[PDB]
Amino acid sequence: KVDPSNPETIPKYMDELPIPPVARPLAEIKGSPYYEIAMRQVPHRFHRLFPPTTVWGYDGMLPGPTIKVQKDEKIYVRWKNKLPEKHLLPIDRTLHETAGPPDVRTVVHLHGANVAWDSDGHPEAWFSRDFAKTGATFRRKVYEYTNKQMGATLWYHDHAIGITRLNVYSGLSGFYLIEDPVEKHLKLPKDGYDIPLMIQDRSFRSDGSLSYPENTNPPAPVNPSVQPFFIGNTIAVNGKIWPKLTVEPRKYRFRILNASNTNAYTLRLGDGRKFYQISTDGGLLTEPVELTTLPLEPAERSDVIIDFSQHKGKKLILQNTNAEGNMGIIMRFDVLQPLRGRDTSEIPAKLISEEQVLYEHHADKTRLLKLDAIQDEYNRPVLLLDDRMWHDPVTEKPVIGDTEVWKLINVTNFAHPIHIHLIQFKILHRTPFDLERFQQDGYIDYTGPPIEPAVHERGWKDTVKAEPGMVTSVIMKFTENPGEYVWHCHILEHEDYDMMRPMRVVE
């Protein structure tokens, strides 16, 4: 008997990985596509032998439909809250905007978008059902995505203040792909050989319902209470637990996204088989990079090419080397489909034809930004950026035209994936420091030389693993779109209490 709450009873590899359908526009105005995407409560089956689970899905599907655009192609999206009045999951009423009704508030952030602030999905721009109540920064029912950025695998997800962890866990995320003009003249695997992989950890009650904590263990006196992490006991890809993908012995492009609330994975293919990275969060690399492991924190993504042609007749497990047991397994590739005509795809010698260089010594401004926790009056951790809470006066006010270096000083014992909106950055380096000395008097005593970014994280990025006991330095240049944005940890349990700060980009 399969008990959804007991992962040892779940037979792995029973579900063929699904491909989310592509969103179709409802209209086109003067050449601009118009989409209408409604958030709905629906059943979704996470495993062949599970009962249906009630979830929240964009257009009633999990993952949400994949939106595809060209670079520089302006589109309009009316994101609609068509959800019930009561939440699926427990709400901590001590957080932002959760004291009373409306409980079900939504706003959609296109993660990685170069977009004007009023279509960025600001956390205070949320709306209840049919826009009946709206947050203070609400501006547009119909968002406008101008897409003036390098081609990339982006993703969209809920960002409503105080409940982002709940709305994303309930199912509100999907892929958004910007095609670069270069790709038309490359021969990357395409069409059915270009497959997105949304990796997420989940836990379930015995009746198949989504399980999310009511409180910590041991419990806080607040009920329900936020917990500063969520680690599931199953891994799903594209909404199916421990699936298989039946592939031909040829090359595929996989668009790999960690859309988990907290958990990070280190991907390994079979017995350390090689695969070829072609993009990071922000777009294509200069040239493919040979990898045998791929670490991904929440919100990080990378596109890779895997060649199955030398693996005909094999089944290869995609491992998560961060964990033992069942959580060490993501999915299985079954190289068992007969080849459907010749593989004409190629791993190219170069991907893009231009690269923008940013130099640390050209920085117009340098920010030292601590990642830490305090204890609240209930003895719960509050995760904080720069000693400040969300509602404290804005301190990050980057100026258009300026090059900035941000130094993320992680004084906690765990990594935090820090996401900066509107821009893409390059990781400069990480440098270890003496944690106890910093705790004593705030002096940064470096205990070793700077370490370069690892080989899989050298492209343009918007989410960076800030390692504990290290200063992680990133570099960026602000070029357009002044307005009200944010930066935050992408562990959603941290973002919601309270590890998010305003970023006011100014002219």
Point out which residues bind Mn ion (CB under 5 A).
111, 299
Nearer to Cu ion, 247 or 383 (CB): 383
d(CA 236, CA 47): 9
Q: Does 96 bind Cu ion (CB under 5 A)?
A: no
CB of 491 to Mn ion, least distance (A): 11
Contacts of 131 (CB under 8 A, 6+ apart): 81, 141
Q: Which does 456 bind (CB under 5 to 8 A by kind): Cu ion, Mn ion, none?
A: none
Segment interacting with Cu ion, rule: CB under 5 A, options 16-24, 174-182, 193-201, 491-499: 491-499
Which tokens belong to 244? 């298989």
Closest C-alpha among 99, 93, 105 to residue 220? 93
Q: Which does 491 bind (CB under 5 to 8 A by kind): Mn ion, Cu ion, none?
A: Cu ion
Q: Does 380 bind Cu ion (CB under 5 A)?
A: no
CB of 241 to Cu ion, least distance (A): 26
CB of 231 to Cu ion, least distance (A): 14
Closest C-alpha among 467, 463, 507 to residue 487? 463
Q: Does 416 bind Cu ion (CB under 5 A)?
A: yes
Closest C-alpha among 133, 71, 88, 72 to residue 107? 133
CB of 163 to Mn ion, least distance (A): 15
CB of 485 to Mn ion, least distance (A): 13
Q: Which does 299 bind (CB under 5 to 8 A by kind): Mn ion, Cu ion, none?
A: Mn ion
Q: Which does 289 bind (CB under 5 to 8 A by kind): Cu ion, Mn ion, none?
A: none
Closest C-alpha among 419, 366, 425, 424 to residue 396? 366
Q: Does 409 bind Cu ion (CB under 5 A)?
A: no
Written as one string, the DSSP assignment of 360-395 is: GGG-SEEEEEEEEEEE-TTS-EEEEETTB-TTSPP-
Q: Does 44 bind Cu ion (CB under 5 A)?
A: no
> How far is it between the farthest Cα atoms of the chain?
66
Closest C-alpha among 432, 239, 251, 402 to residue 331? 239
CB of 121 to Mn ion, least distance (A): 9
341 CB-contact burial (10 Å; exposed 0-12 / middle 13-18 / buried 19+): exposed
Nearer to Cu ion, 110 or 241 (CB): 110
**Footprint (CB under 5 A) of Cu ion, residues 185-204:** none
Segment interacting with Cu ion, rule: CB under 5 A, options 11-19, 100-108, 448-456, 482-490: 482-490
Q: Give the residue, chosen from 255, 370, 477, 494, that forms a contact with Cu ion under the rule CB under 5 A.
A: 494
Nearer to Mn ion, 168 or 269 (CB): 168
Nearer to Mn ion, 39 or 289 (CB): 39
CB of 161 to Cu ion, least distance (A): 11
Nearer to Mn ion, 297 or 457 (CB): 297
Segment interacting with Cu ion, rule: CB under 5 A, options 188-196, 231-239, 285-293, 493-501: 493-501
Q: Which does 268 bind (CB under 5 to 8 A by kind): Cu ion, Mn ion, none?
A: none
Nearer to Cu ion, 427 or 489 (CB): 489
Q: Which does 492 bind (CB under 5 to 8 A by kind): Cu ion, Mn ion, none?
A: none
CB 171 within 8 A of CB 106: no
Cis status, amide bond into 20, omega within 30 of 0: no
Which helix (H) or strand (E) segment is 78 a member of? Answer: strand 75-81
Q: How many CA atoms lie within 13 A of 198 on its CB side?
A: 28
Which tokens belong to 392? 């404290």
CB of 411 to Cu ion, least distance (A): 12
140 CB-contact burial (10 Å; exposed 0-12 / middle 13-18 / buried 19+): middle
Q: Give the residue, chosen from 489, 492, 503, 505, that forms a contact with Cu ion under the rule CB under 5 A.
A: 489
CB of 101 to Cu ion, least distance (A): 25
Q: Give the residue, chosen from 491, 492, 503, 505, that forms a contact with Cu ion under the rule CB under 5 A.
A: 491
Dihedral angle computed from the Cα positions of residues 394, 398, 400 and 402, in that order, rounded to the nearest 10 degrees: 170
Segment interacting with Cu ion, rule: CB under 5 A, options 135-143, 431-439, 452-460, 494-502: 494-502
Q: Which residue is nearest to Mn ion (CB)?
A: 111
Q: Which does 245 bind (CB under 5 to 8 A by kind): Cu ion, Mn ion, none?
A: none
Residue located via tokens 């609400």: 138
Q: Does 165 bind Cu ion (CB under 5 A)?
A: no
Q: Does 430 bind Cu ion (CB under 5 A)?
A: no
Q: Which does 494 bind (CB under 5 to 8 A by kind): Cu ion, Mn ion, none?
A: Cu ion
Q: Does 370 bind Cu ion (CB under 5 A)?
A: no
Order of strands across the sheet that contains 315-320: 244-247, 329-335, 315-320, 265-269, 294-296
Q: Which does 489 bind (CB under 5 to 8 A by kind): Cu ion, Mn ion, none?
A: Cu ion
CB of 466 to Cu ion, least distance (A): 8
Q: Which does 416 bind (CB under 5 to 8 A by kind): Mn ion, Cu ion, none?
A: Cu ion
CB of 79 to Mn ion, least distance (A): 15
In three state form, how does the secondary structure of 414-426 look?
A: CCEEEEECCCCEE
* N- to C-terminal Cα separation, the chain: 62
CB 1 within 8 A of CB 222: no
For the range 212-218, what are the long-range contacts, defined as Cβ-Cβ under 8 Å and sequence gap of 24 or more? 212/89, 212/90, 212/166, 212/169, 213/90, 214/90, 216/380
Number of residues that bind Cu ion (CB under 5 A): 4
Q: Which residues bind to Cu ion, rule: CB under 5 A?
A: 416, 489, 491, 494
